[PDB]
C-alpha cells in the first residue's frame, strides 16, 4: 500500500546512478527470491588527444600482422591538432565496452561506419585510425578520424562466472576541461532506444565446379552446394547513422541536452520497459544495421529469387559482447573543442548476477528478496519525463525523492495513502540561456 | 485515477477503426515520450471476377520469363463464371500486403497451399492461377483457383524511412453487392491468433565428390561439406489450413460471425497482448507452417540422425514483409456468391512510426506523450468479449463508449471513481435470425 | 474487486498440483476468450535398480546397429549393487520427457555430461550406460553411470494436434521405500530457473579442394565454401553442471529442501513470470550449454577471426522436444540410498491446448473465459516465498488457501475488500530437525 | 459419453461428476411422447422449454411434488404451414425468421 | 461433443461413382459421362431425403431423386464402395446397382 525503502533506494540509484547520496547498492524490487550478487563497477578515464605511440591502423596492413602503429603519418594528425576538433562518444547498451570514443577533425556530416571489418579494434588507451572516405586506414592513406572502445575487464571476468545477469543502472559523467582561454565549444547529448536483436543474415555458399578431364574420371561433378544459408548469429543494433548526426539529434528530440562544452555532461541511461528479467550471458559479435541492398521478394520476383530475400548491409564492429536489452543507447557530441582538451569520463555501472554454484561470485551473495511493484510503476511513469542529460556537476537533485518520487507515487491506481504531496508541472531545461527550472518551477542557480 | 480523453480516443479507434466518429488520429497511451509520427492508410478496392487480361500463371512456365498471361485457358474460368463461386479473404498481420484474396469454383475442402514456391505472386488488380491439385499452374493445365495480394505501396515507402513502428489498429470492411435476383450466398468471419515467429529450418549442404582420374592428381578428394545447416530466416505463420476451412471456423469459434452475403462484413482486427512495444522494420520472407516430415530425434534414433531434427514442410509465399506481432489473423469466406458479384474492400490501417532523423517522416511528427494505464487495462479486459465481426453497415455502435467502456472501466482494481455505471450482460449476436442483442440486451434494429 | 472462484482453483492447482482436493481442472485466468482444451496427465513409475535385460550401451558400438544390450559387463553393475548408490532426477521444463533419471555408484563430483552425442537414449523402462570418464560406453569399457528419460506418449500425440499450448502446472512426487533395516540415505531438492532459449551456434563448412591433374582439365578449382555458417536451431539449456552438484545446490539456495531419504519429496515446479502466453508446438533438439571454447572477437583479433565468434561447447542430448518457457528446472538427489530401493515417481502435468480445427482435441473443449488479475498478482507475489519442495506425504497444506492466499490477496494495490485476514511471518522448514513451522508459526506434526 | 481407455487420448480429458437424479430421468421418460418430431430450422431456444415445460411436468411423476401448481399443460398445435402455431401453454409463436 | 457442418448441393460430375459390377474389384469408377442424364434431372424439380439411423459413425444418409419415390427402395445386391459425403454413388432407376451406360 506504500512504497518500501528498498523501492526508494532502487529508484534513486536507477535515476541518479552517480548521485553523491547513492553509496549503498540495492537490487531490482521484483522479489525473485533468488540468491544474487550485485556488483558496482566505477571507472575513470582521462581521455585527451592521443600521442603517436598509442595509435594503430586498421587497414589490411595490420591484417595478419598484429596491431601496426602509424609510420609517422602522425604529421597529419598534428595538423588536426592545429585546428578545433570534434569528439563523439556513443554509449551502446553493451555490458563491457561501455562506450565508444571517436575523434574527428571537424564536425562529421553523418556518423559513418566502415564497411570492411576493421582489424584489431583498440581498447581505450590506444586508438585506431580510419580514412576520410569511410574506409580502413593503412599507412600512407589520408586519416579521417580516430576511434576506440572503453573496456571494463572486471565485467568480463564476472560475466564469465554467472548463470544470469541483468543491468540495474548505468551513468556516464563527462567532466570537461581545457586550458584557460580555450574553453570554447558546445556539447549535445541524447538517448534513444535501439531495437537491437539477435539476427542472422542470408549468405551464399561455395560449390565445387569440376569438369573432370581425367581419362578414367569423366564424372564432371558440378554439384551445386551454392545455396542460401544463414550467417553466424550476431547482435545487430539499428542506429540511425544519418540521424546520429549532431543537428539531427538536436532537432529530433525535445529532451536533447545542449550546453557549453565546459559544462560537461551526465547521462543516466534509462531502461525502456517495465520488467527487467534475468538473462544468461550470451556474448555475440556486435554489428550495425545498414541499409538493405537486396530487396529480394519485397517485389514480384521469379520463383527462384525467393532465396536472397531482404538482406541488409551489415557493418561488423569486430567486437563481441552481450548487451543489456531494453536500455537506451546514449550519444554525446563535443563540437569545436580546443585540441588540447581533457575529458574525464566517469562511468558507474551497477548490475545483478545469479552466481554459478562454486564460482567466485557465489561467496559474495546477499539475500534480500524485496518486492515492490509501487516503485516499478513509479519508474514506469517517470521514465518518459526525465531529461536525457544534465551538466556534469548537476548531481544531488533536490526535486528528486522527497518531491518527484512522492509526487508520482500517488498517481498509480488506488495505491495511494498520503492525500496529496505537490503539483507537478512542466520543467524547462535551458542550460544555454540560464533560464532552467525544475519539475516544480523552482529556478536552478548555477553551482559551477 | 480516471481515464483520460486520449485513452478514450485510442480505445475508440482500436475497437472501431472504421467508425464514423473516429476522424482524428491518436497514438498508443504508453507515454514513451518519444517523438512519433502516426500514419493512417485508408484504401478501397472494387474486387470482382477478373478478366483475362489480369490473370497470370505461376507455374514453371513463368519461371525465368516474367509474368505470363493465360494462353486462352480462360474458357475454363468462364465455365466457373457459369456457376456459383466462393471468395475467401485472409487478413494476415502483414503490414503491407494487407489481405490475400482467393477465388474458388466451389467451396474448398480445406485451405490448400502450394508446395513449390510460386513465380511472381500478383498484386490485387492482377491475379495468379493455381491448379486443382494444389500445384502451380502452367498454361494447358486445369485451373483450380485464383489468388492475389492487396498491396499498400505507401506503407512500404514509409516503412523504409522509420527506425521503429507499431501497429495501432486495423479494420477491414466488405461492402458486398450483386445484381438484383442474384443476392444469394452466405458470409462467415473469424479471427484467431497465430504464433507466427522468426524461424530457420534445417537444410543440407552440397559437397563435392571427386575421384581424381588425373595422372598426377590422385587426390580423390571426397570432402564432405554435406552437413546440416540453417536456411535463411523466414517469418513462419502457423495457420490451421485444415481448420481454416469454412465449417471448421464456423463450429470452432463461438464468436464467428455468420450472415447472409449481402450483409458484407466488418472485421476490426484486435491485438492479443497488453503491451505494444516498438519494433524495427525487419522485412523477411513469409511462409506457412506445414506438417513436419522428418521426425528426427523425436524418437530414439542413432547418434548420427540428431542432425536432421524435427523439420517441417514450409510453404513459401514468395512474399517478403514485416508483420505486426500479437495481432489476430482474420479470415472471411463468401459462399455461394453469384459469379457477377462486386465486393468493395475498405481497409483502414493506423500505425505509429519513430522517424529516422532526416527522413521524410521527421517533418510530420507530433509530441503528445500521454500515459493512461486505465485505458490499457480496459482494452485488456474488453478484448476477450468483443465480437469477431459485424455486418458491413454496423458502424457507430451506440453501446461502445458511453456505456461499454465506462462499464468495464470501473472493474480494474481500485481505479474506480464513479460509483456504478451499468450492469453488463451476455450479448447474443444472431445476424441470421434477426434476434441480435448488444451487451445490455437492447435489440438492434436493422439499419440496412 | 474480489478474487473469483476460478482464480482460487487455478492458484490451488498451480501451487499444489498433486494435492488431494485438486480433483477438477481449471485453466489460466487470462480471459483469452478462446476455445481451449485442458489436459491432465498423471503417470506413475516404479523405478528401481534395473536388470540386465533393460540396459543398453550408447557408445559407437550401437551406432548404426540399433540399441545394444550389455555383453555381460553387468557384473560390474552388480558390484555397484554391493554398495550404496546415488540417484539423481532432473526435471527439465520439457513437455514430454518429463524427467531424467540417473544412477551413480557414489556421489558424483559434478553433473557431468557426454561430449559426443549418445546413440539411442532410452525411455524409462530401459536405461543407457555411460563410462566413468564422461564418455559414451561400448561393451568392454568400465561403466560410470546409468541414465534414462521418463516419456509421456499421450503428451506427444496431443501436442501433434494442437495449434498452441501452455503449461498450467506440474508436480513430481517421489514416494521412497527400501527394505527394513536399509532406510539410510539423504534427499535434497532444489528448483532454479534456466534461461533456455533457441540458439544456433557457429560452424564451418566443407569446401572442395581440387588440383585438376587432368590433361584438358587444368582448372585447379580450389573454390572455398569453407566459410562460417549456422547450425540447425536447438533449444539450449544453461544448467550449471558444476553447481548442479549436491553440495552446491544445498549451500546455494536457502529454499533447498533436505531430509532423510525415506521422506521422499514433492516438487511443485513453479513458473518464473507473471504472464503465460500461448505458444505453437515447435519441437527442437535439446542441448546443454557447456563452456565456450573459441573466444573469438571477445579479444582484439585480426579482421579475419571475426567469423568464429564466441562459440560454446554444446552437449547434445539427442532428444527433441518443445519446452515450457519460464518454468523452473527442478533437481533432486538421493544420496547413500540402499541399492535395493524402490522409488515411486508420480508426475502430474496439467496444460492447456488450442485445438487445431478438425483434430482430436476439438471435441473436448470447454468455454470458460474467466478473467482474474487478482489471482495473477497473488501468484506473482507468492512465487518468491514458497518452498522448493516438501516431504512426499505433505499434501493438503492447511495454511494454503483459507489463510495464505487470503493473506497475500489483500496486499495488491487497492484491490482489497476484507479489512485484514492474518499476519504473515517467516516459515522455518527444517525437516531434518523436526522443528518445522509454516507461514504462521504453527508447528507441523509428522503425519508419516 | 466415453469410458476412456488407459493411455489413450481420452484419458487426458476425464471429468469427475457422478451426479444422480431420478427426477430428470423420469421427466425425460414422461416427455418423450409429447415433444414434436421436428421444428423449423430457426426455431431454437424455446421459451416454454425448461423453466416452464420441465417444471410443469416435473411434479407429475409419482407424488414427487413440492410446488403445489406450476402451470397447466395443454395440447400444442404445430401448424407450421398455416402460421397458427401454439406451444404447450397456448402462447402463439410469431415468426422469428 | 462433435459439431459438424456440411453444404450439400447438386454434385458435379467429379463426385459421382458407379456402384455396379463395373467397380467391383476396380476401385470407385467415376461416371463415364452419363452425366447428361443427371443434368436432365437438373432441368426439373428434385427430391432430397435424409435418413438418420442411430449409427454413430455415418450420422446421416443423403439421397437425391429426380422425383418423389413411392418407397425407400434398396438394392438386394450389395453396392460397391459406398461413398462418404463429398462423393456420391449412383443407383439405377430399376432399383439396382448402376454401371456406366444404364439409367440412373
Residue numbers in the entry:
A (entry chain D), B (entry chain D), C (entry chain D): 66 to 513
D (entry chain C): 417 to 513
E (entry chain C): 105 to 208
What does the study report here?
The RNA genome sizes of LSV1 and LSV2 are ~5.6 kb, encoding three major genes: the Orf1 with the unclear function, RdRP responsible for viral RNA replication, and the capsid protein (CP) for the host recognition and viral capsid assembly. CP forms the capsid shell that protects genomes and is responsible for both host specificity and receptor binding to transport the viral genome into infected host cells, or for intracellular trafficking. We determine cryo-EM structures of T = 4 and T = 3 capsids of virus-like particles (VLPs) of Lake Sinai virus (LSV) 2 and delta-N48 LSV1, belonging to tetraviruses, at resolutions of 2.3–2.6 Å in various pH environments. Analyses of these capsid structures reveal the intermolecular interactions that drive subunits assembly into homo-trimeric capsomeres and eventually into a complete viral capsid in which specific domains, such as the N-terminal domain, the helical domain, and the β-barrel domain/C-arm, could encapsidate nucleic acids.
